[PDB]
Write an enzyme that holds these catalytic residues in place. Structure first.
Site, PDB file in Angstrom:
ATOM      1  N   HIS A  67      87.121  13.436  98.045  1.00 52.70           N
ATOM      2  CA  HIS A  67      87.453  12.220  96.932  1.00 52.70           C
ATOM      3  C   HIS A  67      86.171  11.509  96.479  1.00 52.70           C
ATOM      4  CE1 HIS A  67      86.970   9.227 100.558  1.00 52.70           C
ATOM      5  NE2 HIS A  67      86.701   8.248  99.430  1.00 52.70           N
ATOM      6  N   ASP A 109      90.303  16.461 102.849  1.00 55.51           N
ATOM      7  CA  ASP A 109      89.290  15.550 102.099  1.00 55.51           C
ATOM      8  C   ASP A 109      87.793  16.010 102.579  1.00 55.51           C
ATOM      9  OD1 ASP A 109      87.919  13.441 100.338  1.00 55.51           O
ATOM     10  OD2 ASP A 109      88.687  11.799 101.680  1.00 55.51           O
ATOM     11  N   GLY A 137      81.916   2.958 100.211  1.00 60.80           N
ATOM     12  CA  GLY A 137      80.594   3.237 100.032  1.00 60.80           C
ATOM     13  C   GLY A 137      80.206   4.097 100.995  1.00 60.80           C
ATOM     14  N   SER A 187      82.165   6.511 102.407  1.00 62.30           N
ATOM     15  CA  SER A 187      82.964   7.728 102.488  1.00 62.30           C
ATOM     16  C   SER A 187      81.986   8.940 101.962  1.00 62.30           C
ATOM     17  CB  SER A 187      83.894   7.405 101.190  1.00 62.30           C
ATOM     18  OG  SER A 187      84.612   6.631 101.290  1.00 62.30           O
ATOM     19  N   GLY A 188      82.326   9.954 102.542  1.00 59.64           N
ATOM     20  CA  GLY A 188      81.618  11.366 102.833  1.00 59.64           C
ATOM     21  C   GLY A 188      80.565  11.438 103.482  1.00 59.64           C
TER      22      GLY A 188
END
Ligand SMILES: [Ca+2]
Length: 223
Positions: free
Chosen positions: A40, A84, A175, A177-178
């Site tokens: 995402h 994801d 922020g 995320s990942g």
């Protein structure tokens, strides 16, 4: 990261910032040419920033390298966030040293109760918005399957796990995320989703990296 602490400069040397004229997601360096992040977080024009602490000041130790490839998992579903995961290839190899280093992939899955380290430059507030200059860290346990599923009925797949705190106040957030969830030296999670952040009975949901180790290696080997 809500309820965390300042990591200290370059104490998480595998943490990267994905930048598109602004920090938008985290990632984890897994070798000198490849970063693991969340599907995402996909967009074109990604610049990977390694060796960061203060993302708003050039301190020394930074390496800014453009993504040459951004590879979303073919079975990524943007509604459920199942699968994801994204692999970013760097245009040139990062220069690895004590402050820029790769993180090992799991050889097996982690267990409920295992303490992990979650990190990023995401929102530090559960209600409003505040984005930090320096990298924030949070120690959080992996929760049981059933607890995770009780928290998020019908939304947790076998490619997800919950980590964090059911009492509220300690979580990853927008922020982050990942970015990495590292447990016993292995990248076991990717910051994926959750209902708000650091809300009671709504823990963080993470991409279960141990299911993707073979996929990561073959994708890297093919590209
Ligand atoms: Ca910096």
């Amino acid at each position: 990261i809500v309820g965390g602490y300042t990591c200290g400069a370059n104490t998480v040397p595998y943490q990267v910032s994905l930048n598109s004229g602004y920090h938008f997601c985290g990632g984890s360096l897994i070798n000198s040419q490849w970063v693991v992040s969340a599907a995402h977080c996909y967009k074109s024009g990604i610049q990977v920033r390694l060796g960061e602490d203060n993302i708003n000041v050039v301190e020394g130790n930074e390496q800014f390298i453009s993504a040459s490839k951004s590879i979303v998992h073919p079975s990524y579903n943007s509604n459920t966030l199942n699968n994801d995961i994204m692999l970013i290839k760097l245009k040139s190899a990062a220069s690895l040293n004590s402050r820029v280093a790769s993180i090992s992939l799991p050889t097996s899955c982690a267990s409920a109760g295992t303490q992990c380290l979650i990190s990023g430059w995401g929102n530090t507030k559960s209600s409003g918005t505040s984005y930090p200059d320096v990298l924030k860290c949070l120690k959080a346990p992996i929760l049981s399957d059933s607890s995770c599923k009780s928290a998020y009925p019908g939304q947790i797949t076998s490619n997800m796990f919950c980590a964090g705190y059911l009492e509220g106040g300690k979580d990853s957030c927008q922020g982050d995320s990942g970015g990495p969830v590292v447990c016993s030296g292995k990248l076991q999670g990717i910051v994926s989703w959750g209902s708000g952040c650091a809300q009671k009975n709504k823990p963080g949901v993470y991409t279960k990296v141990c299911n993707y180790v073979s996929w990561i290696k073959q994708t890297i080997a093919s590209n």
